[PDB]
Structure 1
Amino acid sequence: PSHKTFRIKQKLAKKQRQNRPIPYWIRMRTDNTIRYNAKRRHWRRTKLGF
């Protein structure tokens, strides 16, 4: 909706930031296991359910 409540706007703000590739310098960091962001979300595939 274009008329979204502030709660939903605030909580859709965070799921914006939650969707970015890992910083490249995470991969070179010692004793690391992070291979990619295994929690990405695409808007056509996974609906946030709210």
Structure 2
Amino acid sequence: AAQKSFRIKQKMAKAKKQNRPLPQWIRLRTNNTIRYNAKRRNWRRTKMNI
């Protein structure tokens, strides 16, 4: 919030990492079951609770 504490940055910093699409090579493994990254998060759609 423009002057965070490190506990919030670090949680943001991980949460940013999760915000990528499926690496397209995983769709190709044997028995690969995952189609699309089902957990993707968007900043103006779901707030993450500090």
Specify the TM-score bucket, using the shorter chain as the normaliser: over 0.9
Between the two proteins, the alignment pairs up a number of residues equal to 50
Give the structure, 1 or 2, with the largest relative contact order (CA under 8 Å, sep 6 or more): 2
Q: Which stretches of structure 1, 4 residues or more, deviate above 4 A after TM superposition?
A: none
Structure 2 alignment gaps of length 5 or more: none
Q: Distance in 1 between matches of 2:49 and 2:8?
A: 11
Percent identity between the two aligned chains: 68
The alignment's C-alpha RMSD in Å is: 0.6
1:36 counterpart residue number: 36
TM-score, scaled to structure 2: 0.94
- Give, in angstroms, the shift of residue 22 of structure 1: 0.8
